Amino acid sequence: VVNFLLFESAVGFSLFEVVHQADTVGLELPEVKDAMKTLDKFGKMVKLRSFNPWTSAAQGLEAINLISEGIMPEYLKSALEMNLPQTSGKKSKVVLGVADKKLAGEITAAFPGVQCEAADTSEVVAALLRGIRTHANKLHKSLQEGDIGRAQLGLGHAYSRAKVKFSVHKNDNHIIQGIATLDALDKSINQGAMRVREWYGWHFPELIRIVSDNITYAKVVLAIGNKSSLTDESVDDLANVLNQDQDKALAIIQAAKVSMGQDISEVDLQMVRDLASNVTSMADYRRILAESLDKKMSEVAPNLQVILGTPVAARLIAHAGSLTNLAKYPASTLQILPKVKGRISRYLANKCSIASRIDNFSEKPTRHFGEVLRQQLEQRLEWYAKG
Amino acid sequence: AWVADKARFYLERAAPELREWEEKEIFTKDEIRNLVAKRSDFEHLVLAPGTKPTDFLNYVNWERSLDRLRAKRCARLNIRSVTSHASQARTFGIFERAVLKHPGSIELWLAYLEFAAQVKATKRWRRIMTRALRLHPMNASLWTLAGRRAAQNGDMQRARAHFLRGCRFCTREPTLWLEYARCEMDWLARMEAKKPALSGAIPIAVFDVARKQPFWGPAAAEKFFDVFAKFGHLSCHERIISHVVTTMQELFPNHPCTWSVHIRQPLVGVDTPAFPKALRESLARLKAALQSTTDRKALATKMVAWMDGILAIEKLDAAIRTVLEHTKRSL
């Protein structure tokens, strides 16, 4: 005969007081199973008595950790002390129903006057908690803040990530998405620089003729203003751009003096210089991405970084998808990702897969294994030079 | 939805009191038809599938208002036989199935507690309070209501037990801990008015465990000092205040809150020659705090709030009024 029963849920645990308990002898009957199924014949069995939510997601994580380990938590002991009538089993006990037998034993050793019944051992409390877990979305809804799906989602992620220690050594998503950003804005930079190159050489073609390096082009067009305001070594700029006094500045000024491009309007020059500022901002952000990505590559997978080099190694990582896929791939599938070229290519694929599995299955990887492998590659390079 | 049947039971329960009101000359038959129709509509809405605590509350308000109007008509017609017994019984029935249908609505729980405390059911009130605390443990307002009405009754042990279970549960916001310290020092005050407690060490104990509770902060200690500084007319109040300010000095050496309590420390029992001497003392402490190395913006905002309180107090000197206006203006 049951009196109260605990029920631990994701948002928190609640204890119900049973009224008009179920028959334990005819428990395998279609009528009592139908009554357990429907809701209008189970709310007569179960009446809600006490609820306790978690205070914070860290506290709920602590709840799952202690409960799955079997040890009751202190605030669960507090809530049971609040709800159960105070007694020791000298003359009158209280029957509780819980799911885990170890939790039953611990609650019994905490409160002497509470005899627990385990869902593992007693079919009546088994069927009772089964009905409650089935209709759990309706019984709590009068005080259920929100719904239960998102809480179960987040609580399961918190518990499993705490058991795995996942975010300490998962960073491959940052690596691959950085690579995709890098080559995306590299293409965008190339296209925008070509655009401003044509779009300003319409006004001044000798600058196109004499200055390559479209980033330096964007810099010098942000610098030059209009075709009519030229002096060679004005302030702080051309000597750190390029050679200053005797190589290019006089050439540019002379090309402007002989130049026959169209005059440009003020607002058109403003728009051109805004586009050039845009291009140089993306180029500066590119070099920032490259530096931070080299450092992150050295932190994540250093053996690949020293064998292949960061750009192509991260291309391989990006194409495989993650370090786990890269390591799970054998050598020849990694090859899919004369005769000397084929020989050194298969050899390099083998050493690449070795570096991948090392740098993935370490916790915090090291560098000297990749240094030893690169030394072996250089020695095979000398071996093929012997030919 | 057998709500026709359930409403039939409740109206057949309500019928004989209406027969009493008809055999007496208190309500006439047209009024009684209006009453039974309104009660039928209310009971059907209450037992309907889609219901709301506002609907239960409006039915409660109607039944209670009918009880009041019946009392007025009875006292006008000079009768004494008709009582409020059936009316309070049916109101209790409405509230009981109200909290059954919607247990998680603290609005309805508080209205039910208000009804019990109004019509004089103290034991019933303790039972209702226990059930509502079991359904809403994290309600600082409910815990304070339980503890404060128990201390108003005089059950210091029961008001204790309520507050101790409350601060065992509600550990996130310090409001309940402030309320327990408030009630404990009110008990010390009631004992001093009646004239261990000679020490008065229970608020110090509450402070020592509040230091390790996870709400423990500078502003939390500031609230503690505020509720300690109210009603300073006591015996060991200076001992308590000194322990609080020494603990805050030992923990947060340069927090603007700690400087604020060092500012307002010697103003415990001031209202009169004892007032302006402590005023000058705290003015020196305030100027030292304003010139010392502390977050001057936060400290001065605390101080101008404090001086807003001071200027809200009246019956002061014009000279000190003008110098407080100047010191507040220089911030």
């Binding site: - | 226990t130 605390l133 029961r158 279970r165």
Partner: peptide, 28 residues
């Protein structure tokens, strides 16, 4: 009778707050 909340004893004291409160109430 789980009707109301009964006052604490040393048997049913959970936290350090309740332990010290009962210590002080004993030493009074």
């Amino acid at each position: 009778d789980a009707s109301e909340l009964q006052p604490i004893t040393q048997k049913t004291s959970g936290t350090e707050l309740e332990q010290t409160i009962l210590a002080i109430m004993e030493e009074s």
